[PDB]
Amino acid sequence: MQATIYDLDGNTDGEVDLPDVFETPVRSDLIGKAVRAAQANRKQDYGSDEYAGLRTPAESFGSGRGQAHVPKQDGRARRVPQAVKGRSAHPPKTEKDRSLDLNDKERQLAVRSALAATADADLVADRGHEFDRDEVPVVVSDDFEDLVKTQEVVSLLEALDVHADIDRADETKIKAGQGSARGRKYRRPASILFVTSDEPSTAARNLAGADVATASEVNTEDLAPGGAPGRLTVFTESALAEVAER
Amino acid sequence: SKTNPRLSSLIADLKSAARSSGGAVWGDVAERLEKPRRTHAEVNLGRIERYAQEDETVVVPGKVLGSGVLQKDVTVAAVDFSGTAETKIDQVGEAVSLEQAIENNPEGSHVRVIR
Amino acid sequence: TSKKKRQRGSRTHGGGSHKNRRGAGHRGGRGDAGRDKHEFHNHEPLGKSGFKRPQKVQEEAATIDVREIDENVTLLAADDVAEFRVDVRDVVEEADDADYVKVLGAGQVRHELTLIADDFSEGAREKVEGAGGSVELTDLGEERQ
Amino acid sequence: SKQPDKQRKSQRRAPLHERHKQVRATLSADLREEYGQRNVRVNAGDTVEVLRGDFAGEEGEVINVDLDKAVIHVEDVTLEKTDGEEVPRPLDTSNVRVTDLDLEDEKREARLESEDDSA
RNA sequence: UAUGCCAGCUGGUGGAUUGCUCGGCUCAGGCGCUGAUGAAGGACGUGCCAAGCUGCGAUAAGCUGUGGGGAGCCGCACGGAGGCGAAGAACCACAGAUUUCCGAAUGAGAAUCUCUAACAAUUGCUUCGCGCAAUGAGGAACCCCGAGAACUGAAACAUCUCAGUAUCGGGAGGAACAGAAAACGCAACGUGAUGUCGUUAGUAACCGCGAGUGAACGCGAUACAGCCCAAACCGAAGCCCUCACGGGCAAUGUGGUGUCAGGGCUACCUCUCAUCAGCCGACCGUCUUCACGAAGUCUCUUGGAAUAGAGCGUGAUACAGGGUGACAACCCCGUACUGAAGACCAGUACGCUGUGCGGUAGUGCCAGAGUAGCGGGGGUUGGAUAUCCCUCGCGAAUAACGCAGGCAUCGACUGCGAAGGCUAAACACAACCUGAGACCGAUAGUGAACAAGUAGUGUGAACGAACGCUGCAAAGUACCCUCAGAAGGGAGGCGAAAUAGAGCAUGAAAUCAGUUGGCGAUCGAGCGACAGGGCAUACAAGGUCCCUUGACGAAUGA
RNA sequence: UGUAUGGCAAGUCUAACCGGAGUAUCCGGGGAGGCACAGGGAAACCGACAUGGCCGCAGGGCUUGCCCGAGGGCCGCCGU
Ligand SMILES: [Cl-]
Ligand SMILES: [Cl-]
Ligand SMILES: [Cl-]
Ligand SMILES: [Mg+2]
Ligand SMILES: [Mg+2]
Ligand SMILES: [Mg+2]
Ligand SMILES: [Mg+2]
Ligand SMILES: [Mg+2]
Ligand SMILES: [Mg+2]
Ligand SMILES: [Mg+2]
Ligand SMILES: [Mg+2]
Ligand SMILES: [Mg+2]
Ligand SMILES: [Mg+2]
Ligand SMILES: [Mg+2]
Ligand SMILES: [Mg+2]
Ligand code: NA
Ligand code: NA
Ligand code: NA
Ligand code: NA
Ligand code: NA
Ligand code: NA
Ligand code: NA
Ligand code: NA
Ligand code: NA
Ligand code: NA
Ligand code: NA
Ligand code: NA
Ligand code: NA
Ligand code: NA
Ligand code: NA
Ligand code: NA
Ligand code: NA
Ligand code: NA
Ligand code: NA
Ligand SMILES: [Sr+2]
Ligand SMILES: [Sr+2]
Ligand SMILES: [Sr+2]
Ligand SMILES: [Sr+2]
Ligand SMILES: [Sr+2]
Ligand SMILES: [Sr+2]
Ligand SMILES: [Sr+2]
Ligand SMILES: [Sr+2]
Ligand SMILES: [Sr+2]
Ligand SMILES: [Sr+2]
Ligand SMILES: [Sr+2]
Ligand SMILES: [Sr+2]
Ligand SMILES: [Sr+2]
Ligand SMILES: [Sr+2]
Structure with missing residues (x-):
């Protein structure tokens, strides 16, 4: 197919052939698997102290005083799982493998399929993104990588009728539950992904919900956040070309 | 519970073709596809060369693999083909998707089931 | 659940x-x-x-059937095309750490082959010679006496 | 760090010299233009305007700056006790804006005017 | 209807629940020795008022200097009195001063005190004098060298297993140990110090051949680095102390040469950039700390309070996190960007100085003994005949010789020189610093979010808790009445709220006081389920229900 | 050792580790080695049906009981 290239003012500047990978059939089950693997592989090993509740010489008196055979020390019950200040029976262990394996071919096919989900304008709108376009992905000229100001990228996206997605992601949710106490207080919608070629867009990164990436290392999570395919993306002409041999 | 959306669609399309048209194979291939993956066909080329004949479509209710030689000018229809199978078949015939075979022949005529 | x-x-x-x-x-x-x-x-x-024999006196031969060679001759265009001529030592994988390369005679031979290997079976010859061809033994294969 | 526990911890346990950054208030339009800063460390001579509490809108002289509790006493921003005595209601400097400064110190004026440093 | 039963209402009791997190738990990166110059630890002191904690040491919550910092300050701890600070205090960084007693504890003794100069004790050097030095003890674990169980498994049990584990003795470091082949033995025309990681592999091997036990070579990686003696031939050409003088050492050999690409001696060829010694001495990176650092505190409504809703506007290489009277990029700290410093890497790399690499021929000059090896007895190992070690006895050769290549002997072949020695880097741990989290969230998570190893128990070894939350702001309740009264009570005051009033957010159940509805002093006990009556009921969140008659009308059926 | 799902398929998967980077995630590299690709025999050693026959399910075909009949079943034959 064909993809229309845009200059820094939002005007048409030719067009190059949209690569073959964008014609790979959307496979949400494989994409969801690749994201689940990525999200679990960064999870840290935890576990309670191996000796918690075991640091006591508590002994059970046995039969005789009309009491249950529970280990006691100073009249206070200890050690056993049913006792207050006792050990945890089947607690979280550090020795546990919290990582998920994925075959390279199966993971690569998911990257390709997620890249393909970018091409379908109906899927992109179904995922949640707010925009006024027919053609998708938004293809911009290589002169994008040279922008320094963030407010200049705003002007370009307003010219491309694609800014409404950042107005969507400009609303933080204060999460329900104790995640708050651990630093995970806020969360916001995932908006536009900016795929470049040389270095990630310093100019676009601070935009609400925007994620920046590079064509040599853009993954399934960037392409399909939370396993949901069809992210509103914007490539660089050379990024669109480099993302072909993936 | 098949997790692949494409396999789910194919099975639905095989059923629709078995009911609407005169096909008694497409709904029979749908029944084997609904069965567990281990019961599916993993057919090599040396088997299609042994039992297939020309101008009669070969339907595989699974996947075609590339071991052995195929000389016959046959049209093989399957759920999937290995990279080497599709290449070796297209040399002396045609490797057609099962999704296409339904549109080409909804009545399921002149077809041999090979597993 | x-x-x-x-x-x-x-x-x-x-x-x-x-x-x-x-x-x-x-x-x-x-x-x-x-x-x-x-x-x-x-x-x-x-x-x-x-009983078991000591590991360093134990030889491991790399085997290949005539069927595997014959099925892949046109695909093995990277080798010699004579009046077909193929050196088996270059076809078999894992043939580096193996003691010798042996050609076994299982399957059909629908081509005229000239095979060069360290060892051959009685059935590997009958099937290649009977389908118009030759069997060439290597300098390493000159142990049969 | 990013951790809330560690963030609040470092603020409550900050040494006296680092508590200066906790008593900072925003400067007026004229003052931001004059010194090239947005905010300043509030001093016990400055004049300030209350922007957020119950006393929002009132102006007065800064009578006391307590670094320990990180609060300030402003003139007439008082609470009446049961005996009738008027005691000061402490203010967080974040809810306040500086309208006039006290420049009796040579060092504070020099710090405010230099472009390489901030006060 | 008394005693009383069931449910509820108001108020208690209690402290669950929900929300909150100054604490934990776990992972990761960095860093890493202290001590006779008396440590670590402990005791007792030290404040204006001072019991606990923290600090400090008779100069006693501190003294001095340099740098930073800045108008405030006098720790935890918000009192009173008083004081200090522009002579630049507080506070932070580095450096220095002081630094009681016990403590390895060292003059001697001793439950932290005492008695009449003290390296006690053991050593090396030695002016043979404690003159100069060393050792001792501590440290979370890691590391190295020794001693070495049992429960248990084998469905009993002895070999075996648990296990060279627990525990004990000795010892070093910031890492330890190992280490430049008398190697390997994919047997080769091959590899080439050592650790470690992945694999080889639950393979070989062991084993009441039961249960079980269990390598290696090689390979792929990490990181790389190779050297010094003894002797031959030289023979005082030498070393140590001292400013020097002078002394001490040393022919029982200091020093030169040399170290399997064998060397030495003799004879020549050529030449060095190897090696060893020494000088100089980083970049980058990493960890930590710091400086700087954009943009609203505008309108209306609600509110005790905007950080809420609606409206208008702004930054962003910064929309991580926190604070702020409610949901904050733009109010405050920070955050991106840029830059600074210290520490580690590392006294390493590079560079330099010096030395001199090597080759030919001749020469039986030299080359580590209770050793190699054999035997008796044991332990250990996968080590089987073929592991490693201990013990008793015996015991060789001299490179023209010797050892190894998984049974012994002899020959061949291939490999390699033991009985002297050193050695960076890559790896272990987590005390210490910092960072992180699908961990816990106050009966949890550490025993410990609180006075925590505290209170307390035991002669002692040792054992060992519980206790988090007023409020936006103390505005922490003046005055009056009552009372034996700083009690308590009443009235009153503050605040949005006192049913937020002091272990004071919320405030469950068990349960208690008062009270409402139902039952109740002639009556029977799994406390109910399902039916149907009485009595009782504010709203809301349910709106149906009764009777005449009429339509329909299964099985059944006068 | 089964099973369900998914990728690849006569093959398949990387391990330690290397490079990159948005720096525990992630992208690229790494096939050492494992399992599969032939078995039988203690060992020495030797080394197999890419189909020859008959039934026949599903399915296809035809002129509507007659054919073709993968898989499956019963035999042959082959390696040791
Ligand atoms: Cl097959
Ligand atoms: Cl064997
Ligand atoms: Cl080797
Ligand atoms: Mg516990
Ligand atoms: Mg909850
Ligand atoms: Mg300034
Ligand atoms: Mg003494
Ligand atoms: Mg037993
Ligand atoms: Mg037994
Ligand atoms: Mg063992
Ligand atoms: Mg070995
Ligand atoms: Mg020398
Ligand atoms: Mg043993
Ligand atoms: Mg607790
Ligand atoms: Mg309360
Ligand atoms: Na304890
Ligand atoms: Na009891
Ligand atoms: Na049971
Ligand atoms: Na783990
Ligand atoms: Na090899
Ligand atoms: Na009574
Ligand atoms: Na350290
Ligand atoms: Na005190
Ligand atoms: Na001191
Ligand atoms: Na001493
Ligand atoms: Na002496
Ligand atoms: Na037993
Ligand atoms: Na017994
Ligand atoms: Na045994
Ligand atoms: Na504020
Ligand atoms: Na012995
Ligand atoms: Na050897
Ligand atoms: Na508690
Ligand atoms: Na391989
Ligand atoms: Sr008894
Ligand atoms: Sr190989
Ligand atoms: Sr303070
Ligand atoms: Sr305080
Ligand atoms: Sr038990
Ligand atoms: Sr038996
Ligand atoms: Sr090396
Ligand atoms: Sr020697
Ligand atoms: Sr032998
Ligand atoms: Sr006792
Ligand atoms: Sr009152
Ligand atoms: Sr009727
Ligand atoms: Sr069961
Ligand atoms: Sr692979």
Whole structure:
């Protein structure tokens, strides 16, 4: 197919052939698997102290005083799982493998399929993104990588009728539950992904919900956040070309 | 519970073709596809060369693999083909998707089931 | 919903009587205990059988059937095309750490082949010579006497 | 760090010299233009305007700056006790804006005017 | 209807629940020795008022200097009195001063004190004098060298296993240990110090051949690095102390040469950039700390309070996190960007100085003994005949010789020189610093979010808790009445709220006081389920229900 | 050792580790090695049906009982 290239003012500047990978059939089950693997592989090993509740010489008196055979020390019950200040029976262990394996071919096919989900304008709108376009992905000229100001990228996206997605992601949710106490207080919608070629867009990164990436290392999570395919993306002409041999 | 959306669609399309048209194979291939993956066909080329004949479509209710030689000018229809199978078949015939075979022949005529 | 997930409230968790899932007595001892007594069933019989030769005197031959060569001749265009000529030592994988390369005679030979290998079977010859061809033994293969 | 526990911890346990950054208030339009800063460390001579509490809108002289509790006493921003005595209601400097400064110190004026440093 | 039963209402009791997190738990990166110059630890002191904690040491919550910092300050701890600070205090960084007694504890003794100069004791050097030095003890674990169980498994049990584990003795470091082949033995025309990681592999091997036990070579990686003696031939050409003088050492050999690409001696060829010694001495990176650092505190409504809703506007290489009277990029700290410093890497790399690499021929000059090896007895190992070690006895050769290549002997072949020695880097741990989290969230998570190893128990070894939350702001309740009264009570005051009033957010159940509805002093006990009556009921969140008659009308059926 | 799902398929998967980077995630590299690709025999050693026959399910075909009949079943034959 064909993809229309845009200059820094939002005007048409030719067009190059949209690569073959964008014609790979959307496979949400494989994409969801690749994201689940990525999200679990960064999870840290935890576990309670191996000796918690075991640091006591508590002994059970046995039969005789009309009491249950529970280990006691100073009249206070200890050690056993049913006792207050006792050990945890089947607690979280550090020795546990919290990582998920994925075959390279199966993971690569998911990257390709997620890249393909970018091409379908109906899927992109179904995922949640707010925009006024027919053609998708938004293809911009290589002169994008040279922008320094963030407010200049705003002007370009307003010219491309694609800014409404950042107005969507400009609303933080204060999460329900104790995640708050651990630093995970806020969360916001995932908006536009900016795929470049040389270095990630310093100019676009601070935009609400925007994620920046590079064509040599853009993954399934960037392409399909939370396993949901069809992210509103914007490539660089050379990024669109480099993302072909993936 | 098949997790692949494409396999789910194919099975639905095989059923629709078995009911609407005169096909008694497409709904029979749908029944084997609904069965567990281990019961599916993993057919090599040396088997299609042994039992297939020309101008009669070969339907595989699974996947075609590339071991052995195929000389016959046959049209093989399957759920999937290995990279080497599709290449070796297209040399002396045609490797057609099962999704296409339904549109080409909804009545399921002149077809041999090979597993 | 899994089996484990449906266990809360069952008391015994599928164990039967609550007097069952205790120690190793329920297993009849620890590990392979009683393999010659109460649990003798389906166990390989006790005893010593045969001998083993030292590992550095043990040779490992790389095998290949005439069928595998013959099925891939047109695809093996990277080799010699004579009046077909193929050196087997360059076809077989894992043929570096192997002692010698042997051609076995299983399958058909629908082509005229000139095979060069360290060893051949009586059936590897009959099938290649009978389909119009030759069998060439290597300098390493000159052990047969 | 990013951790809330560690963030609040470092603020409550900050040494006296680092508590200066906790008593900072925003400067007026004229003052931001004059010194090239957005905010300043509030001093016990400055004039300030209350922007957020119950006393929002009132102006007065800064009578006391307590670094320990990180609060300030402003003139007439008082609470009446049961005996009739008027005691000061402490203010967080974040809810306040500086309208006039006290420049009796040579060092504070020099710090405010230099472009390489901030006060 | 008394005693009383069931449910509820108001108020208690209690402290669950929900929300909150100054604490934990776990992972990761960095860093890493202290001590006779008296440590670590402990005791007792030290404040204006001072019991606990923290600090400090008779100069006693501190003294001095340099740098930073800045108008405030006088720890935890918000009192009173008083004081200090522009003579630049507080506070932070580095450096220095002081630094009681016990403590390895060292003059001697001793439950932290005492008695009449003290390296006690053991050593090396030695002016043979404690003159100069060393050792001792501590440290979370890691590391190295020794001693070495049992429960248990084998469904008993002895070999075996648990296990060279627990525990004990000795010892070093910031890492330890190992280490430049008398190697390997994919047997080769091959590899080439050592650790470690992945694999080889649950393979070979062991084993009441039961249960069980269990390598290696090689390979792929990490990181790389190779050297010094003894002797031959030289023979005082030498070393140590001292400013020097002078002394001490040393022919029982200091020093030169040399170290399997064998060397030495003799004879020549050529030449060095190897090696060893020594000088100089980083970049980058990493960890930590710091400086700087954009943009609203505008309108209306609600509110005790905007950080809420609606409206208008702004930054962003910064929309991580926190604070702020409610949901904050733009109010405050920070955050991106840029830059600074210290520490580690590392006294390493590079560079330099010096030395001199090597080759030919001749020469039986030199080349580590209770050793190699054999035997008796044991332990250990996968080590089987073929592991490693201890013990008793015996015991060789001299490179023209010797050892190894998984049974012994002899020959061949291939490999390699033991009985002297050193050695960076890559790896272990987590005390210490910092960072992180699908961990816990106050009966949890550490025993410990609180006075925590505290209170307390035991002669002692040792054992060992519980206790988090007023409020936006103390505005922490003046005055009056009552009372034996700083009690308590009443009235009153503050605040949005006192049913937020002091172990004071919320405030469950068990349960208690008062009270409402139902039952109740002639009557029977799994306390109910399902039917149907009485009596009782504010709203809301349910709106149906009764009777005449009429339509329909299964099985059944006068 | 089964099973369900998914990728690849006569093959398949990387391990330690290397490079990159948005720096525990992630992208690229790494096939050492494992399992599969032939078995039988203690060992020495030797080394197989890419189909020859008959039934026949599903399915296809035809002129509507007659054919073709994968898988499956019963035999042959082959390696040791
Ligand atoms: Cl097949
Ligand atoms: Cl064998
Ligand atoms: Cl080798
Ligand atoms: Mg516990
Ligand atoms: Mg909750
Ligand atoms: Mg300034
Ligand atoms: Mg003494
Ligand atoms: Mg037993
Ligand atoms: Mg037995
Ligand atoms: Mg063992
Ligand atoms: Mg070996
Ligand atoms: Mg020398
Ligand atoms: Mg043993
Ligand atoms: Mg607790
Ligand atoms: Mg309360
Ligand atoms: Na304890
Ligand atoms: Na009891
Ligand atoms: Na783990
Ligand atoms: Na049980
Ligand atoms: Na090899
Ligand atoms: Na009574
Ligand atoms: Na350290
Ligand atoms: Na005190
Ligand atoms: Na001191
Ligand atoms: Na001494
Ligand atoms: Na002396
Ligand atoms: Na037993
Ligand atoms: Na017994
Ligand atoms: Na045994
Ligand atoms: Na504020
Ligand atoms: Na012996
Ligand atoms: Na050897
Ligand atoms: Na508690
Ligand atoms: Na391989
Ligand atoms: Sr008894
Ligand atoms: Sr069961
Ligand atoms: Sr037990
Ligand atoms: Sr038996
Ligand atoms: Sr190989
Ligand atoms: Sr303070
Ligand atoms: Sr304070
Ligand atoms: Sr090396
Ligand atoms: Sr020697
Ligand atoms: Sr031998
Ligand atoms: Sr006792
Ligand atoms: Sr009152
Ligand atoms: Sr009727
Ligand atoms: Sr692969």
